Amino acid sequence: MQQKLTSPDNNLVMTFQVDSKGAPTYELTYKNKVVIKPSTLGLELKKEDNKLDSKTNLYDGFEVKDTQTATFDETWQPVWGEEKEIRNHYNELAVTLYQPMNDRSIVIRFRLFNDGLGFRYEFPQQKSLNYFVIKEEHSQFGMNGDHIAFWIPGDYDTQEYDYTISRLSEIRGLMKEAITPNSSQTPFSQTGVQTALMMKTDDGLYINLHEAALVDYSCMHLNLDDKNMVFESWLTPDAKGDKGYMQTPCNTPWRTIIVSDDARNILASRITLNLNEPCKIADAASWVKPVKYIGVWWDMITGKGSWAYTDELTSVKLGETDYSKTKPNGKHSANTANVKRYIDFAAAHGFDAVLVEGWNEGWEDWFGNSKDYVFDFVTPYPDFDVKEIHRYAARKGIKMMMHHETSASVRNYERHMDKAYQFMADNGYNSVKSGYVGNIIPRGEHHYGQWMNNHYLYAVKKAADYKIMVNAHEATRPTGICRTYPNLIGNESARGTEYESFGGNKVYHTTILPFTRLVGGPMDYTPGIFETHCNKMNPANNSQVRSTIARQLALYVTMYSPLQMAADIPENYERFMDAFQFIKDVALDWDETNYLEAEPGEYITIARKAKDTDDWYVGCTAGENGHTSKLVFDFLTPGKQYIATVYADAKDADWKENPQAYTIKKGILTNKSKLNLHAANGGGYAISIKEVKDKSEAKGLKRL
Amino acid sequence: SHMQQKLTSPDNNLVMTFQVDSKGAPTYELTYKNKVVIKPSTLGLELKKETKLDSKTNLYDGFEVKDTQTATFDETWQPVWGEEKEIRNHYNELAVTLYQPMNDRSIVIRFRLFNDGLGFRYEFPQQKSLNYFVIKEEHSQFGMNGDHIAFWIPGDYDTQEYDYTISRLSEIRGLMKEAITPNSSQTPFSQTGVQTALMMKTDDGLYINLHEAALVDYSCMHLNLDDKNMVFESWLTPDAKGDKGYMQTPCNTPWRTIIVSDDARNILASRITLNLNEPCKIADAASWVKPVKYIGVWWDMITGKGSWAYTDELTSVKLGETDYSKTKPNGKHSANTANVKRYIDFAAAHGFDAVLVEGWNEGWEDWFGNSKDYVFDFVTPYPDFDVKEIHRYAARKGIKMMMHHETSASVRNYERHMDKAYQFMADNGYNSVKSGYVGNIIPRGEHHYGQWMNNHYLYAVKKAADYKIMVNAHEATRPTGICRTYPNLIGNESARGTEYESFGGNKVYHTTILPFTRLVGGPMDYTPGIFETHCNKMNPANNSQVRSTIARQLALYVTMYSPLQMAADIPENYERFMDAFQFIKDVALDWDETNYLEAEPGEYITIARKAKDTDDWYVGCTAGENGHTSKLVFDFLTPGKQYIATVYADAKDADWKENPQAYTIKKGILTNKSKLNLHAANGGGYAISIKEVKDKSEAKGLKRL
Numbered sequence A: 001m002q003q004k005l006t007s008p009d010n011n012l013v014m015t016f017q018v019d020s021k022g023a024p025t026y027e028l029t030y031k032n033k034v035v036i037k038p039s040t041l042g043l044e045l046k047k048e049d050n051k052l053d054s055k056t057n058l059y060d061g062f063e064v065k066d067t068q069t070a071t072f073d074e075t076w077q078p079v080w081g082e083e084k085e086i087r088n089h090y091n092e093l094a095v096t097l098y099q100p101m102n103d104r105s106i107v108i109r110f111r112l113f114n115d116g117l118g119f120r121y122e123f124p125q126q127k128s129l130n131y132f133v134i135k136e137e138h139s140q141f142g143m144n145g146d147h148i149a150f151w152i153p154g155d156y157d158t159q160e161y162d163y164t165i166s167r168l169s170e171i172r173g174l175m176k177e178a179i180t181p182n183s184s185q186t187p188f189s190q191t192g193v194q195t196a197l198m199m200k201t202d203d204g205l206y207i208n209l210h211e212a213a214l215v216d217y218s219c220m221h222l223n224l225d226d227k228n229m230v231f232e233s234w235l236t237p238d239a240k241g242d243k244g245y246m247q248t249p250c251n252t253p254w255r256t257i258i259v260s261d262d263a264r265n266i267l268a269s270r271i272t273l274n275l276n277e278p279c280k281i282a283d284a285a286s287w288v289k290p291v292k293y294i295g296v297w298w299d300m301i302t303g304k305g306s307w308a309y310t311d312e313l314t315s316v317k318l319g320e321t322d323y324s325k326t327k328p329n330g331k332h333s334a335n336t337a338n339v340k341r342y343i344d345f346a347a348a349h350g351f352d353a354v355l356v357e358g359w360n361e362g363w364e365d366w367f368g369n370s371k372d373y374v375f376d377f378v379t380p381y382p383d384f385d386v387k388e389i390h391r392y393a394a395r396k397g398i399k400m401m402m403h404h405e406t407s408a409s410v411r412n413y414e415r416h417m418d419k420a421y422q423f424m425a426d427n428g429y430n431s432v433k434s435g436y437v438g439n440i441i442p443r444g445e446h447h448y449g450q451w452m453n454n455h456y457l458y459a460v461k462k463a464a465d466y467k468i469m470v471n472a473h474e475a476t477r478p479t480g481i482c483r484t485y486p487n488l489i490g491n492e493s494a495r496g497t498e499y500e501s502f503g504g505n506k507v508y509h510t511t512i513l514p515f516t517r518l519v520g521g522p523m524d525y526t527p528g529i530f531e532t533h534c535n536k537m538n539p540a541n542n543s544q545v546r547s548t549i550a551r552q553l554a555l556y557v558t559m560y561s562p563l564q565m566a567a568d569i570p571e572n573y574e575r576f577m578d579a580f581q582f583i584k585d586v587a588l589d590w591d592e593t594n595y596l597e598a599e600p601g602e603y604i605t606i607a608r609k610a611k612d613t614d615d616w617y618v619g620c621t622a623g624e625n626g627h628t629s630k631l632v633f634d635f636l637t638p639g640k641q642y643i644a645t646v647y648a649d650a651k652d653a654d655w656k657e658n659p660q661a662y663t664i665k666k667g668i669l670t671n672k673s674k675l676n677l678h679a680a681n682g683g684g685y686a687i688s689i690k691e692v693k694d695k696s697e698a699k700g701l702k703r704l
Numbered sequence B: 001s002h003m004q005q006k007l008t009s010p011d012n013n014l015v016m017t018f019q020v021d022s023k024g025a026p027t028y029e030l031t032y033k034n035k036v037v038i039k040p041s042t043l044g045l046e047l048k049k050e051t052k053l054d055s056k057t058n059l060y061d062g063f064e065v066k067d068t069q070t071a072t073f074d075e076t077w078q079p080v081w082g083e084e085k086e087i088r089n090h091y092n093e094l095a096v097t098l099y100q101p102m103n104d105r106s107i108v109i110r111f112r113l114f115n116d117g118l119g120f121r122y123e124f125p126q127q128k129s130l131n132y133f134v135i136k137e138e139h140s141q142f143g144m145n146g147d148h149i150a151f152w153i154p155g156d157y158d159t160q161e162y163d164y165t166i167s168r169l170s171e172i173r174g175l176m177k178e179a180i181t182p183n184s185s186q187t188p189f190s191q192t193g194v195q196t197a198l199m200m201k202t203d204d205g206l207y208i209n210l211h212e213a214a215l216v217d218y219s220c221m222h223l224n225l226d227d228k229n230m231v232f233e234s235w236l237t238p239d240a241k242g243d244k245g246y247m248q249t250p251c252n253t254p255w256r257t258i259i260v261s262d263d264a265r266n267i268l269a270s271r272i273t274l275n276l277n278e279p280c281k282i283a284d285a286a287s288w289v290k291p292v293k294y295i296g297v298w299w300d301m302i303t304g305k306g307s308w309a310y311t312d313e314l315t316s317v318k319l320g321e322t323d324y325s326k327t328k329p330n331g332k333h334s335a336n337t338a339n340v341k342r343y344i345d346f347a348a349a350h351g352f353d354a355v356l357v358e359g360w361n362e363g364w365e366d367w368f369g370n371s372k373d374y375v376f377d378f379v380t381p382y383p384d385f386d387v388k389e390i391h392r393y394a395a396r397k398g399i400k401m402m403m404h405h406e407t408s409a410s411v412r413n414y415e416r417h418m419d420k421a422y423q424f425m426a427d428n429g430y431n432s433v434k435s436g437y438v439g440n441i442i443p444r445g446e447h448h449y450g451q452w453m454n455n456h457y458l459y460a461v462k463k464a465a466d467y468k469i470m471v472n473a474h475e476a477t478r479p480t481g482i483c484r485t486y487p488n489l490i491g492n493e494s495a496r497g498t499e500y501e502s503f504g505g506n507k508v509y510h511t512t513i514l515p516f517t518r519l520v521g522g523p524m525d526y527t528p529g530i531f532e533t534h535c536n537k538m539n540p541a542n543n544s545q546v547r548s549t550i551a552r553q554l555a556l557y558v559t560m561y562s563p564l565q566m567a568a569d570i571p572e573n574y575e576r577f578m579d580a581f582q583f584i585k586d587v588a589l590d591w592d593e594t595n596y597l598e599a600e601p602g603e604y605i606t607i608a609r610k611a612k613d614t615d616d617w618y619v620g621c622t623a624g625e626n627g628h629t630s631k632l633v634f635d636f637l638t639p640g641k642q643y644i645a646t647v648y649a650d651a652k653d654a655d656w657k658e659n660p661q662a663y664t665i666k667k668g669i670l671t672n673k674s675k676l677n678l679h680a681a682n683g684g685g686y687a688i689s690i691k692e693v694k695d696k697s698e699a700k701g702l703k704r705l
């Protein structure tokens, strides 16, 4: 009767069966500890526009018709990632479920790894199941206790919320305050949360609930039954309230449960990526590449500068408004002379590209007007010389990063997309930062519905045809699709550094993101703010970045991404050029990654080996209690000497009272070295460890 | 303030009186020859709100006249194609600037009064307190002076493919249920809602038409009747969230029109709709836009004889995955090279310009009602359709192929494929395309006539113009004169066409109403020309019968104006009646002059037109269930000239139901002194070709008629 699937190491066991009413039921244990209590699986379908009642049932009345098992064990290499190779090793169980009352069958495929379980529903092409609409997916995740969760409010339009750390039973009472103001937001439940969801159990376990390969389907959130402690899939509705237009053969994305008694193993898990389809960009390795950049950006985010060219018009209309006849507001940062200054800085310090926002016509009306024809993505303002900027950047060996804020007007963006990408190709742009700020147009749709998920992928696939890399802000959070389309080098899709200018992010924010948001794909977090007091940029902005300078440096290692921005303005980096050296030195791609220390909400310490080098980089980020590390460099090569530079919080450093106090020490390290470092409140540290290649490097240096 | 204003038509017959009432509501009234046409009616709009009412939502009262400007316009222009060579645009104008103290904002209401009607629109100037706004409801009233007889179809956000109903305004409510027949995509909105291009006949001898003009960047207007006070009010089409228009100043609403006369023929002669549209924007239009007479592989599938699909063995298909080469032909796929060539041969042998082919591309297996997103790619042909060979062959025969772009209402999908689709047309010699939008709109939640889709339809036409492509769009929002601005929009169905004669039939009087309603604003691709009226001969399972005689079908080439005319039957049926087919072969598609000889909505329409750049005339008469007797006087012909006339008429015992294929053909001479008595049978009519004699040899052996 019951089906049992075991992980390769025998530590995890998944038991499957249908109850007495034919409802698919599964459960999972880890080291003999209950991780997932008996939980049901199934979906309810929309009644077909006027048997008709029984057809809506795709949740019970099932009989196990057939079962197939198999084992997979292959290694693959991502174009860019946290390590050179990833091993995909799992035991699989596929259950064919027949539903007599509707004469149709579905398949539930289970893949069990040593670090977690993944499952998905498969809908075979058959006589009685072709086109169908999903009313709701009912995938349950029954918890064995009132765990501690690290969560953000379930929302169909934004994920730019600070995390909350509380018991599952406390979520309901905390939801109201957890939902802060945002340009576009649609919370759905007093107990709804987003994925990836991170939890810590009283019996020493760490559990992460998420999904993988979100394609041709609506984004999954989780709704908590806080009486029975059961999380259940809650999909994003379209403009009519429906949750998915399907056509067999088709599959739902995978649902994942990553678990371990060691928090570091959650970060090390590659289940999400392993469950995605293999790379579909044949020549990816020839053009896809990591990018370290700076940009004309923080000016506008802080309010010092503006995206708009003029402030004298009540509104603008592309093709009618003649900007050449308008009065400059004197705050437009995207002007040729200023852009060249950034290009100079980028070239002088080894950066790959320079982002510039506010370069094109239309910014006057970019915010909250639900404007359809808001941008054309190709017409520059009078003070932005596309060709001259291109000429200069190219001569300096710098690439300009295109900016495509859509103001959430999606049909408008698609209509202009080919011309926009061609414009990029014709003017030397091979990477683009897109955005979707505001309520979606078509009006009625949400940012994470099936409709928009299709758009985001459409944009990435078309970009691949033009050999363009994409960094999409406000898009649906990643679920590992980067394996399939490596040109998607980034997404924000979470609360980033920009909010440190909008009131600030919680001190423990970066000690949570790697356990949640980063599972499924890198984030364009835009770290590197040295002048943490925003009033120095804009007197009217009293927001303060909750970090020390040393912790900002650490983020280049603790916030993984092949796309890394040094977000502050050149002048501020010039004020602390000694600390800036770490940002200049740090790599963007890795051959190896060692998670040294990890505890969600408290601290994260990671060491990574730069790809194709013998150099290592270390970073530690900590919460309000700071953190003391006892580092052991036994991961370094035996018999080798290393030049180590330690960027750490000075004594009494503090994110609030003394954020710019840091020390820099240079010495020698070997695999026998041990170091004690203390991360302050909202602080951390960064270490560059370069293999000695010449005696004339250790001169005057002593062992640390 | 500001004593009521008076606006008069050039001929003094119409008078529009405007005044803001005691509560600040803009009010207008209209009289024709001292008879009330429009009783005091208010104008204004309610806006969407951006513990108490927000005054900003109020754009209907609390106004005061701040300024007024009058002007007269009198200019003549020439359409690329039309019912006559030149159109005179002559009106007296009154523009009223209305200031709203409570919101510190102003709007303008512009009135244009012609000898045959009134047009008005709202204008929203760019200003400090009015920039971006959303319309909740437009409140344009049209107060009737009585319980008039109306020729209407159910107000609907998704379809206009309904038969007309003739009833008193007070009877609409009780007839609505039965007037709403089954359709693939329909959204009725009121028990007393009707579609615009509403025709009425009053007890005191007036004919009134209510409609709109220049429907651009705005939601389609329908009319909702208050049958207790007989007041019609603008009812716009909602978007997926229920809103009725996203506006940004400066902007204007489309024009609202009231066409009136005591002579029904003058309703047909009115050019107010076209005159209110913006002038042509296609500079080189004359060099590529041209009328098209065509036939097509079409009726086969409409009747069920053939299929659009290539195979019947699949539960569904997925473009790019389904390999049609490995599928079994269903043996009913009409869109195959050899068959298409037969049509091309026929088109060339009889002087047609183009051949339409439907079911040529992959995907038709799932085209109907699945709300399928990636339903077509508009470029990949089925295994049995050789695009290049057909192009070479058609070119060799002097024929052009008409592209078919059924979208199955999946709009984002069509837009994503549009440039490649139009480029494919250009690369393969297709200069015209018949598009379609069958099914509920995708994005799901939108309706066929909302602001969103109206934008799409125009987007498709404007892009087509860049490719020098002409468009004929089925299921799109009904026309409002935009063809003046974009002459490449040579057609729309957007009403119940001949296809329904195969779906149970159209009412016998249908074609005696369309010219008074649907045709106001633009031509219709009605696809006339069915000679074998019994569909069971095409498909035994189809017992539908076309409600027409053969002679009436010929008449439609003159009474259903269009620069795009199809001869819808299959070649074999035209072969059976080649003598009658001669009229379809001879009739012109564009005209220098049009004379409306007889006209009564629901009963009969008789029209005479002079072919452009010729001295030849064509006449047609279409009648309802009571038939019609005409006393034709050919004084519109040129004095002293001889004409070779061929009369195609119903036999004395003809009847659409019992004897539809009984006709007579007479050839003789006509002069401006000639007179003919003709009788159109029940559901019948007649057609006449009148060619000026160019060589005395042509009149040899012929006598005067």
Ligand SMILES: C[C@H]1O[C@H](O[C@H]2[C@H](O)[C@@H](O)[C@@H](O[C@H]3[C@H](O)[C@@H](O)[C@@H](O)O[C@@H]3CO)O[C@@H]2CO)[C@H](O)[C@@H](O)[C@@H]1N[C@H]1C=C(CO)[C@@H](O)[C@H](O)[C@H]1O
Pocket: A160, A180, A181, A182, A183, A184, A297, A301, A357, A405, A435, A437, A473, A474, A492, A498, A501, A502, A503, A504, A543
């Ligand atoms: C540019 C940015 O705009 C939006 O951010 C808004 C926040 O969501 C609001 O909550 C609000 O923040 C205010 C605080 O609530 C308030 O307590 C005080 O601290 O002042 C804050 C600023 O007024 O206002 C924010 C600005 O409107 C939007 O939600 C966010 O996603 C946008 N960021 C993206 C857009 C662009 C432009 O193309 C890029 O520069 C960024 O990289 C994107 O991430």
Ligand SMILES: C[C@H]1O[C@H](O[C@H]2[C@H](O)[C@@H](O)[C@@H](O[C@H]3[C@H](O)[C@@H](O)[C@@H](O)O[C@@H]3CO)O[C@@H]2CO)[C@H](O)[C@@H](O)[C@@H]1N[C@H]1C=C(CO)[C@@H](O)[C@H](O)[C@H]1O
Pocket: B161, B181, B182, B183, B184, B185, B298, B302, B358, B406, B436, B438, B474, B475, B493, B499, B502, B503, B504, B505, B544
């Ligand atoms: C092709 C055509 O399909 C749709 O027409 C459907 C009618 O709207 C329905 O009411 C229904 O008619 C049936 C009668 O109700 C029933 O009493 C009996 O008489 O049988 C009739 C036929 O079954 O079914 C019709 C067929 O599904 C749709 O509404 C209509 O707009 C469509 N016409 C356009 C589509 C194409 C294809 O690309 C072109 O061939 C035509 O030119 C278009 O006008």
Ligand SMILES: [Ca+2]
Pocket: A160, A473, A474, A492, A498
């Ligand atoms: Ca953002």
Ligand SMILES: [Ca+2]
Pocket: B161, B474, B475, B493, B499
């Ligand atoms: Ca149709």
